[PDB]
Design a protein around this ligand. Structure first.
Ligand SMILES: [Zn+2]
Ligand SMILES: [Zn+2]
Ligand SMILES: [Zn+2]
Lengths: 1118, 249
């Protein structure tokens, strides 16, 4: 009832915003009478947002919940084809509504393919092959932001369409297949470098196996050789046909068989054979065997190949697996202590621990918090340990992904503890929570520990960790392994360094201590002259260097690191020996009283638009409207005007400036030269009686802003304006003008607008699980006022430092959105106070005052925006989201950044008439808002409570059998940059240089930027573009003319000699700083080319000149 | 590695840092028990810098173990920019890789700066006779270079037995600077045979900008041999520069 009452409060707020939107919208100052944007209750309302039909929502709620969207979609297709929603017309209309509607049902309205992806649906005939009919899908421009899965699924729908209508399969001829292959190659070589490059045989056969044909209009202006192809309308490059064909089916072939097998459609054995074609790939320790199984796996080697081809080639260490520590979580978290110091989305978090860092003076200290990094950041030499990361179990990774073995965490160790005392001392101890005083009391009696320490240990094992003597005291009795926190990564180097290492420790000054029969050393005093401490550095052991005692290097390992260091060696009792097929920990655990577990066996990882006023080039160079209205420049563009029947005012204004009556639209007949008001146009059904043409609303004519801008400043009574600019051309369908007063307030409110008429701010969010008020900086009284009553533990929300869960409609935006959207709220308030005459609704003066209001989040290629509520502010430029607020289905379409707008802003500024007709970006328009997101109060409301660090044993014990993340049964058995990035490359590259031990191998990372400089200097070198001073857009021919014949100015040439000379010393100093081969010719050929083009004999090669030094080596060797 | 050295005066060394910063951009002063030295070349291949400062220049000189540190010319140049010669320059380096520059003058200014890891390749310079060694003042070089660099960009050095001349030509503006032993700007001449060579005065401009007025300047060069110019500091230190001759017209 809490979340239900909160939903009721949200509904009341939306009702109030609708009341204000109707009292202000009723004035007629907007191109609408009522609220255009509706609200959606569930997915049924979101499906109807795209194409409808208006009334299928009942069948969606009654069939999707019962039979599933796979069967319910087919049922809806059957209802449309059989004519249950109304007589549409020809079979192309029923097939079109079935594909768009069914596509909207299967994708749950997440994609905008029925809206901006699919242009048309036309049934054609295969007259050139047999004469049978087939289905042809016409795709529009924006298709890449729709995802490759659904693009394939649509075709499957066609397989049903022709199954229900009675069409036939499409027969690609030889010319069609070769033309499509030519489009894949040309589209792949120049336009966009795809991931998987298809082969002619599989495009030929697979394309032959596709039932219906898919094509589209001209997307990329790329001419083809195969021209005038029968059955093809255009002779250009169709990006939609390639992305749906290659990246749609071939990329998702390992899931498309699951959709086909899930729906129950027969005739897709070719994709099944295609999946099958992808399957053409005593003295032995256990840990060594687990490593053999880890190496035998194809997932880490293939992903390591993709990261090694997709980045720095042959620079990472092959022995130490670089990346974050694999920390599983329930369906990313990175310590921000290493973000500013040095793919996927880097989610910031301050709950997990931090890695260890080597200082410049020789010591090694760990950095757990961000403050230490701010202190020791000035002496960081390299970053051995990257950090931690939580990987969700439902991590959607297809194409046969294996589940790598889980690291030995401190939580599973607690489970090992409660099962050890449960199996040995029969004490019942429930880990991951606080127990009663009796069980903890007797456990503290048997284990001889502190009950409070056991409370804080069971409470938080990561924060509270035992020392070394209690761990040794509890390992030699319960027969449990050593503590993971004080466990070094012994499986990081050959055992020879260990065998020599213990011998180096035999002669070291080691003092021993005895505590409860525990013989553990206190400190070790050893010299680095006998053996290198590189293995010790690889173990991550904090030590201290000292050279003031006239000795070279006397490093000392003090407590508790000394005892944790000599514990695996068995206190130097048993001698370690290098054995074949036996690792170090295997030989240690072979003869030792304390067991060990391998912890680290896994490592992972504009536009400046202010008003919709088409000004064109009349604004000068920056399209300034104020300059055109001031000077008197006219704009001969295509615009529409309105007409006032009562008064007689004609203008782009909505309300008559002179009179007090509302004016209507004007319709101009294109053929004739007459204007018809909206009242007269609707009487003749928008048809001119004389000319039998459609009356277009807009027409090309002149525009005088001197007389238009003045008529708008007196309305809202404003005079302080700085600069206002419009657009070059209206991209909407109707091309309707925007009231200028809105811009008159935007220029003084310091806000910007887009083509959709809404102020949408682009931001970046992340899914979270739980947090504390301390990390967000929110008081208990504030959270109580937000509506929070109790936590997930049932206790009332009284403790500040307490783990609290997050609700659905809660967002935490950064300071930029608070101040900006705060200025947007002031724009709405100012818009209501003088332009609409209604009282203010936001009444927000500070950033924190914005808490409590409602926002709307819109995603690319989405027709619905999820209403949210601001609850706080974060220092980081990115925001925070919720998995219920941001579902997992919308994340798979490569959508991270979202557009944030205000509720009342869209309710009072959005208009449907501003929809584009041919073009379109990543999102079209906030057509439907969604607010009801009840997360199964009876079903999932309980499942969501137990998500706070739910780490079972079946996963840690069952992960050694090389399972897959897709095998959810293991869990269900228990559940039932040129500035920052450039310097980042300069520092990380040097770290890689320090990592490879001055052994550089040829690579292409900076060369990836050096090749365009080479082809740009050589290309523009022979161009020599002549541009005079007066004329800029008038280029002169490459031959020399002496002077510009048009203007009396000297001609200026661009041979690209002085602009590229700035990026050359950037990498030239780095390349010059090392002697490497196969690259000297590219480095010295261009600079010597500049020398030969422009035209100091150096006494010798002291500037790192590999020319004289190298040739001298070869000559003297000969 | 830790060491401390106290040199009296700040401006005299600031002239060396000024000349070095105007002639090199990245250098790492190597520290030896004999003194502070630095053998490097400008990264644009214009001059060759060789600083030799014995321990006799320094008042206090305390070394534990010889080692090499890198010093930025810009930052260290800005430190001794307004540094008065009446102060007490103090260089201290302890266990950590920090540099402590304490000034004991009108106001004790204990400074601290990190020391970057310069990868300077220690390169030496070979030995061969030049047969043209002259001893001239510094001010005569100042007025002789700053006036001829405006009329031309290359200057020609010619030295004969008891004769010295530096003539530079151009389009319509010629110049020459002829000095002998009986003049008042030329101290000594050790010319044995006829010597003539051409160099770029544009390098000589910034090369001589940091010279003094009474400092004895010794030049060693040859016909096809490079240019060498060395001068002493407090009668003990030696600063030698060597630049490659111009192979152009
Ligand atoms: Zn009117
Ligand atoms: Zn007409
Ligand atoms: Zn011209």
């Amino acid at each position: 009832p809490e979340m239900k009452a909160y939903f009721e409060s949200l509904q009341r707020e939306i009702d109030r915003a609708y009341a204000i939107a109707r009292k202000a919208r009723a004035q007629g100052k907007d191109p609408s009478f009522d609220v255009e944007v509706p609200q959606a209750t569930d997915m049924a309302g979101r499906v109807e947002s795209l194409v409808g039909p208006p009334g299928v929502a009942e069948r969606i709620r009654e069939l999707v919940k019962e039979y599933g969207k796979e069967i319910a979609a087919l049922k809806v297709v059957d209802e449309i084809i059989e004519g249950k929603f109304g007589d549409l017309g020809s079979k192309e209309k029923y097939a079109e509504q079935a594909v768009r509607t069914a596509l909207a049902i299967l994708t749950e309205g997440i994609v905008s393919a029925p809206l901006e992806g699919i242009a048309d649906v036309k049934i054609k005939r295969n007259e050139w092959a047999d004469g049978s009919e087939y289905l042809a899908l016409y795709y529009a421009g924006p298709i890449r932001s729709s995802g490759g899965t659904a693009q394939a699924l649509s075709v499957l729908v066609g397989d049903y369409v022709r199954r229900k209508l009675g069409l036939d399969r499409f027969k690609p001829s030889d010319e069609h297949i070769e033309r499509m292959v030519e489009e894949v190659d040309l589209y792949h070589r120049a336009v966009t470098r795809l991931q998987y490059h298809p082969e002619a045989d599989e495009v030929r056969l697979a394309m032959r196996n596709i039932p219906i044909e898919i094509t589209g209009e001209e997307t990329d202006k790329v001419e083809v050789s195969h021209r005038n192809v029968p059955g093809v309308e255009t002779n250009h490059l169709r990006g939609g046909a390639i992305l749906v064909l290659a990246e749609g089916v071939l990329q998702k072939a390992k899931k498309l068989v699951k959709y086909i097998d899930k729906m129950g459609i027969e005739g897709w054995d070719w994709i099944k054979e295609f999946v099958e074609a992808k399957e053409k790939g005593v003295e032995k320790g256990f840990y060594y065997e687990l490593y053999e199984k880890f190496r035998a796996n194809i997932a880490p080697n293939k992903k390591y190949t993709k990261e090694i081809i997709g980045g720095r080639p042959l620079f990472a260490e092959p022995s130490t697996n670089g990346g974050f520590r694999l920390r599983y979580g329930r369906s990313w978290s990175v310590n921000p202590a290493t973000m500013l110091i040095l793919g996927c989305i880097v989610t910031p978090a301050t709950t997990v621990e931090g890695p260890i860092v080597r200082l410049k003076n020789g010591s090694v200290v760990r950095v757990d918090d961000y403050e230490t990094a701010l202190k020791v950041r000035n002496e960081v030499d390299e970053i051995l340990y990257v950090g931690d990361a939580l990987v969700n179990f439902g991590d959607f990774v297809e194409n046969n992904q294996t589940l790598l073995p889980a690291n030995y965490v401190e939580e599973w160790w607690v489970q090992e503890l409660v099962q050890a005392i449960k199996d040995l001392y029969e004490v019942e101890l429930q880990p991951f929570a606080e127990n009663d005083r009796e069980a903890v009391e007797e456990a503290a009696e048997y284990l001889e520990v502190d009950p409070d320490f056991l409370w804080n240990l069971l409470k938080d094992p990561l924060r509270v960790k035992p020392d070394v003597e209690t761990a040794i005291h509890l390992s030699t009795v319960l027969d449990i392994p050593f503590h993971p926190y004080y466990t070094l990564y012994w499986n990081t180097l050959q055992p020879e360094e260990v065998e020599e290492l213990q011998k180096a420790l035999l002669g070291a000054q080691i003092e021993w201590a005895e505590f409860r029969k525990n013989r553990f050393a206190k400190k070790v005093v050893l010299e680095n002259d006998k053996n290198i401490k590189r293995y010790l550095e690889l173990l991550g052991l904090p030590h201290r260097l000292e050279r003031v005692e006239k000795k070279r290097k006397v490093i000392v390992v003090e407590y508790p690191w000394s005892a944790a260091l000599l514990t695996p060696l068995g206190n130097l009792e048993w001698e370690f020996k290098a054995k074949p097929f036996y690792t170090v920990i295997d030989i240690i655990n072979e003869n030792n009283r304390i067991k060990l577990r391998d912890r680290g066996i896994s490592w992972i990882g504009k536009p400046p638009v202010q008003v919709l006023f088409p000004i064109g080039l009349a604004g000068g160079q920056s399209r300034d409207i104020k300059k055109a209205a001031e000077e008197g420049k006219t704009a001969r563009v295509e615009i529409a005007f309105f007409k006032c029947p009562k008064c007689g005012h004609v203008g782009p204004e909505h309300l008559c400036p002179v009179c007090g009556t509302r004016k209507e639209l004007l319709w101009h007949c294109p053929k004739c030269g007459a204007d018809y008001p909206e009242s007269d146009a609707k009487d003749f059904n928008y048809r001119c009686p004389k000319c039998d043409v459609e009356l277009k609303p807009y027409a090309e004519r002149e525009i005088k802003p001197a007389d238009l801008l003045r008529q708008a400043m007196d309305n809202v009574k404003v005079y302080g304006i700085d600069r206002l600019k419009g657009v070059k051309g209206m991209t909407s369908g109707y091309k309707m003008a925007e009231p200028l007063e809105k811009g008159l307030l935007r220029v003084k409110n310091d806000v910007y607008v887009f083509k959709d008429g809404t102020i949408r701010f682009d931001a970046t969010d992340a899914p979270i699980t739980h947090f504390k008020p301390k990390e967000i900086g929110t008081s208990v009284e504030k959270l109580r006022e937000l509506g929070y009553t109790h936590d997930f533990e049932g206790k009332p929300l009284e403790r500040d430092d307490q783990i609290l869960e997050l609700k659905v409609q809660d967002v935490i935006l950064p300071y930029e959105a608070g101040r900006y959207l705060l200025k947007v709220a002031r724009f709405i308030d100012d818009l209501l106070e003088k332009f609409y005459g209604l009282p203010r609704f936001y009444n927000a003066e500070k950033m924190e005052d914005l808490v409590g209001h409602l926002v709307i989040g819109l995603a690319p290629h989405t027709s619905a925006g999820i209403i949210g509520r601001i609850i706080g502010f974060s220092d980081v430029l990115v925001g925070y989201a919720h998995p219920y607020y941001h579902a997992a289905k919308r994340r798979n379409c490569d959508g991270d950044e979202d557009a944030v707008m205000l509720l009342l802003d869209a309710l009072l500024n959005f208009s449907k008439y501003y929809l584009p007709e041919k073009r379109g970006g990543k999102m079209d328009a906030p057509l439907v808002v969604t607010t009801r997101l009840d997360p199964r109060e009876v079903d999932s409301e309980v499942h969501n409570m137990d998500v706070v660090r739910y780490y079972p044993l079946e996963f840690y014990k069952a992960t050694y059998e090389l399972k897959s993340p897709k095998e959810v049964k293991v869990i269900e058995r228990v559940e039932d940059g040129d500035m920052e990035e450039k310097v980042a490359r300069q520092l990380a590259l040097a770290e890689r240089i320090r990592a490879v031990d001055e052994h550089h191998v040829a690579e292409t990372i900076i060369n990836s930027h050096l090749v365009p400089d080479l082809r740009g200097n050589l290309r523009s070198f022979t161009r020599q573009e002549f541009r005079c001073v007066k004329c800029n857009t008038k280029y002169r021919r490459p031959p020399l003319t002496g002077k510009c014949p048009k203007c009396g100015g000297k001609i200026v040439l661009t041979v690209s000699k002085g602009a590229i000379e700035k990026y050359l010393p950037t990498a030239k100093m780095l390349v010059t700083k090392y002697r490497v081969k196969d690259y000297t010719r590219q480095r010295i050929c261009i600079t010597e080319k500049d020398i030969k083009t422009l035209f100091q004999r150096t006494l010798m090669g002291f500037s790192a000149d590999i020319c004289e030094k190298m040739v001298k080596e070869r000559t003297g060797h000969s | 590695m830790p060491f401390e050295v106290v040199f009296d005066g700040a401006k005299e060394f600031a002239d060396l840092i000024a000349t070095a910063s105007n002639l090199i951009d990245e250098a790492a002063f190597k520290f030896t028990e004999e003194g502070i030295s630095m053998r490097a070349m400008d990264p644009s291949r214009v001059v060759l810098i060789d600083l030799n400062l014995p321990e006799s220049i320094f008042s206090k000189y305390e070394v534990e173990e010889p080692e090499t540190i890198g010093i930025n010319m810009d930052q260290f140049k800005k430190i001794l920019k307004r540094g008065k010669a009446k102060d007490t320059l103090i260089l201290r380096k302890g266990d950590e890789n920090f540099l402590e520059i304490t000034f004991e003058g009108t106001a004790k200014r204990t400074f601290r700066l990190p020391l970057i890891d310069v990868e300077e390749l220690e390169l030496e310079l070979p030995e061969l006779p030049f047969t043209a060694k002259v001893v001239l003042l510094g001010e005569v070089l100042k007025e002789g270079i700053k006036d001829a660099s405006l009329v031309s960009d290359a200057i020609k050095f010619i030295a004969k037995e008891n004769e010295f001349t530096m003539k530079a030509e151009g389009e319509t503006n010629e110049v020459e600077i002829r000095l002998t032993l009986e003049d008042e700007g030329l101290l000594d001449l050790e010319v044995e045979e006829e010597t003539k060579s051409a160099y770029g005065i544009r390098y000589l401009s910034d090369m001589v900008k940091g010279i003094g007025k009474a400092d004895e300047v010794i030049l060693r060069f040859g016909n096809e041999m490079p240019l060498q110019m060395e001068y002493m500091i407090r009668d003990e230190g030696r600063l030698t520069f060597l630049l490659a001759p111009r192979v152009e017209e």
